[PDB]
Amino acid sequence: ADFDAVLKCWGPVEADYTTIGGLVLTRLFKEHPETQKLFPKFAGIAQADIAGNAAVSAHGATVLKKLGELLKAKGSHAAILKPLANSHATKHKIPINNFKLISEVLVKVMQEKAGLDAGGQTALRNVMGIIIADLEANYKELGFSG
Protein backbone atom coordinates (compact mmCIF):
# COMPACT_ATOMS: atom_id res chain seq x y z
CA ALA A 1 0.00 0.00 0.00
CA ASP A 2 2.78 2.45 0.78
CA PHE A 3 4.23 2.07 -2.72
CA ASP A 4 0.84 2.91 -4.15
CA ALA A 5 0.63 5.96 -1.92
CA VAL A 6 3.98 7.28 -3.19
CA LEU A 7 3.20 6.45 -6.83
CA LYS A 8 -0.06 8.48 -6.72
CA CYS A 9 2.21 11.51 -6.19
CA TRP A 10 5.15 10.58 -8.44
CA GLY A 11 3.69 12.23 -11.54
CA PRO A 12 5.30 15.65 -11.05
CA VAL A 13 8.61 14.01 -10.34
CA GLU A 14 8.60 11.81 -13.44
CA ALA A 15 7.24 14.78 -15.47
CA ASP A 16 10.51 16.68 -14.99
CA TYR A 17 13.17 14.51 -13.53
CA THR A 18 15.79 17.23 -14.30
CA THR A 19 14.04 20.05 -12.52
CA ILE A 20 13.01 17.95 -9.55
CA GLY A 21 16.36 16.18 -9.51
CA GLY A 22 18.08 19.57 -9.28
CA LEU A 23 15.74 20.62 -6.47
CA VAL A 24 16.58 17.48 -4.52
CA LEU A 25 20.38 17.64 -4.83
CA THR A 26 20.41 21.44 -4.27
CA ARG A 27 18.35 20.99 -1.10
CA LEU A 28 20.48 18.05 0.01
CA PHE A 29 23.66 20.16 -0.21
CA LYS A 30 22.02 23.10 1.53
CA GLU A 31 20.42 21.22 4.41
CA HIS A 32 23.16 18.57 4.74
CA PRO A 33 26.27 20.40 3.57
CA GLU A 34 28.61 17.62 4.56
CA THR A 35 27.09 15.42 1.85
CA GLN A 36 28.46 17.60 -0.93
CA LYS A 37 32.04 16.43 -0.38
CA LEU A 38 30.83 12.88 -1.11
CA PHE A 39 30.30 14.03 -4.74
CA PRO A 40 33.86 15.09 -5.77
CA LYS A 41 32.53 16.44 -9.08
CA PHE A 42 30.26 18.87 -7.14
CA ALA A 43 32.25 19.35 -3.91
CA GLY A 44 33.33 22.93 -3.43
CA ILE A 45 30.66 24.51 -5.62
CA ALA A 46 29.26 27.48 -3.67
CA GLN A 47 25.62 26.91 -2.67
CA ALA A 48 24.43 29.91 -4.72
CA ASP A 49 25.72 28.17 -7.88
CA ILE A 50 24.07 24.78 -7.34
CA ALA A 51 20.38 25.45 -8.19
CA GLY A 52 21.31 26.60 -11.70
CA ASN A 53 23.93 23.93 -12.35
CA ALA A 54 22.97 21.67 -15.24
CA ALA A 55 25.35 18.87 -14.25
CA VAL A 56 23.85 18.76 -10.75
CA SER A 57 20.33 18.64 -12.18
CA ALA A 58 21.29 15.96 -14.72
CA HIS A 59 22.69 13.81 -11.90
CA GLY A 60 19.55 14.41 -9.86
CA ALA A 61 17.50 13.20 -12.84
CA THR A 62 19.59 9.98 -12.94
CA VAL A 63 18.98 9.50 -9.21
CA LEU A 64 15.22 10.07 -9.39
CA LYS A 65 14.86 7.88 -12.54
CA LYS A 66 16.54 5.06 -10.71
CA LEU A 67 14.37 5.59 -7.65
CA GLY A 68 11.28 5.67 -9.91
CA GLU A 69 12.39 2.22 -11.25
CA LEU A 70 12.55 0.91 -7.64
CA LEU A 71 9.21 2.44 -6.72
CA LYS A 72 7.47 1.09 -9.80
CA ALA A 73 8.91 -2.39 -8.90
CA LYS A 74 6.94 -2.36 -5.59
CA GLY A 75 9.40 -4.29 -3.44
CA SER A 76 10.57 -6.86 -5.98
CA HIS A 77 13.70 -5.13 -7.03
CA ALA A 78 16.90 -7.23 -6.66
CA ALA A 79 18.29 -6.71 -10.16
CA ILE A 80 17.82 -2.94 -9.78
CA LEU A 81 18.86 -2.56 -6.15
CA LYS A 82 21.89 -4.85 -5.83
CA PRO A 83 23.96 -2.90 -8.41
CA LEU A 84 22.92 0.34 -6.70
CA ALA A 85 24.14 -0.96 -3.30
CA ASN A 86 27.31 -2.34 -4.84
CA SER A 87 28.30 0.91 -6.56
CA HIS A 88 27.38 3.15 -3.57
CA ALA A 89 29.22 1.03 -1.04
CA THR A 90 32.32 0.30 -3.10
CA LYS A 91 32.78 2.92 -5.84
CA HIS A 92 31.15 6.03 -4.41
CA LYS A 93 31.89 4.95 -0.81
CA ILE A 94 28.74 6.49 0.63
CA PRO A 95 28.02 5.50 4.25
CA ILE A 96 24.46 4.28 4.59
CA ASN A 97 23.21 7.10 6.81
CA ASN A 98 23.42 9.45 3.83
CA PHE A 99 20.49 7.68 2.21
CA LYS A 100 18.37 8.64 5.16
CA LEU A 101 19.26 12.31 4.51
CA ILE A 102 18.40 12.29 0.82
CA SER A 103 15.13 10.50 1.55
CA GLU A 104 14.02 13.22 3.94
CA VAL A 105 14.99 15.84 1.39
CA LEU A 106 12.87 13.98 -1.16
CA VAL A 107 9.94 13.93 1.30
CA LYS A 108 10.22 17.72 1.61
CA VAL A 109 10.53 18.33 -2.12
CA MET A 110 7.53 16.07 -2.85
CA GLN A 111 5.45 17.82 -0.18
CA GLU A 112 6.17 21.13 -1.95
CA LYS A 113 6.08 20.10 -5.60
CA ALA A 114 4.15 16.84 -5.84
CA GLY A 115 1.21 17.07 -3.49
CA LEU A 116 2.61 14.56 -1.04
CA ASP A 117 0.45 15.12 2.05
CA ALA A 118 1.17 14.01 5.60
CA GLY A 119 0.00 10.43 4.98
CA GLY A 120 1.97 10.28 1.73
CA GLN A 121 5.05 11.49 3.60
CA THR A 122 4.66 8.65 6.06
CA ALA A 123 4.32 6.23 3.17
CA LEU A 124 7.43 7.55 1.43
CA ARG A 125 9.47 7.31 4.63
CA ASN A 126 8.33 3.72 4.93
CA VAL A 127 9.21 2.90 1.33
CA MET A 128 12.60 4.59 1.61
CA GLY A 129 13.06 2.52 4.79
CA ILE A 130 12.48 -0.67 2.79
CA ILE A 131 14.97 0.44 0.12
CA ILE A 132 17.56 1.57 2.66
CA ALA A 133 17.27 -1.66 4.71
CA ASP A 134 17.92 -3.66 1.53
CA LEU A 135 20.86 -1.39 0.57
CA GLU A 136 22.26 -1.81 4.07
CA ALA A 137 21.97 -5.62 3.98
CA ASN A 138 23.90 -5.56 0.71
CA TYR A 139 26.49 -3.14 2.11
CA LYS A 140 27.08 -5.58 4.99
CA GLU A 141 27.50 -8.50 2.53
CA LEU A 142 30.29 -6.46 0.94
CA GLY A 143 32.02 -5.56 4.21
CA PHE A 144 30.62 -2.05 4.64
CA SER A 145 29.19 -1.10 8.06
CA GLY A 146 30.26 2.52 8.60
Ligand code: HEM
Ligand atom coordinates in the same frame (compact mmCIF):
# COMPACT_ATOMS: atom_id res chain seq x y z
C1 HEM B 1 18.16 6.14 -3.10
C2 HEM B 1 18.97 7.24 -3.30
C3 HEM B 1 19.99 7.21 -4.41
C4 HEM B 1 19.84 6.72 -5.63
C5 HEM B 1 18.65 6.10 -6.34
C6 HEM B 1 21.11 6.96 -6.31
C7 HEM B 1 21.33 6.61 -7.62
C8 HEM B 1 22.55 6.83 -8.27
C9 HEM B 1 22.81 6.40 -9.61
C10 HEM B 1 21.79 5.71 -10.51
C11 HEM B 1 24.08 6.73 -9.92
C12 HEM B 1 24.86 6.44 -11.20
C13 HEM B 1 25.16 4.93 -11.37
C14 HEM B 1 26.01 4.47 -10.22
O1 HEM B 1 27.16 4.96 -10.16
O2 HEM B 1 25.55 3.66 -9.37
C15 HEM B 1 24.61 7.35 -8.72
C16 HEM B 1 25.90 7.86 -8.60
C17 HEM B 1 26.40 8.46 -7.47
N1 HEM B 1 25.72 8.57 -6.28
FE1 HEM B 1 23.88 8.08 -5.86
N2 HEM B 1 22.02 7.54 -5.46
C18 HEM B 1 21.34 7.70 -4.28
C19 HEM B 1 21.88 8.26 -3.15
C20 HEM B 1 23.14 8.77 -3.04
C21 HEM B 1 23.66 9.49 -1.88
C22 HEM B 1 22.82 9.66 -0.62
C23 HEM B 1 24.90 9.89 -2.16
C24 HEM B 1 25.85 10.67 -1.31
C25 HEM B 1 25.38 11.45 -0.32
C26 HEM B 1 25.19 9.39 -3.52
C27 HEM B 1 26.38 9.60 -4.16
C28 HEM B 1 26.64 9.21 -5.45
C29 HEM B 1 27.87 9.50 -6.11
C30 HEM B 1 29.06 10.19 -5.53
C31 HEM B 1 27.74 9.02 -7.44
C32 HEM B 1 28.76 9.10 -8.53
C33 HEM B 1 28.64 10.43 -9.26
C34 HEM B 1 29.60 10.50 -10.43
O3 HEM B 1 30.81 10.21 -10.27
O4 HEM B 1 29.14 10.84 -11.53
N3 HEM B 1 24.09 8.71 -4.03
N4 HEM B 1 23.68 7.40 -7.69
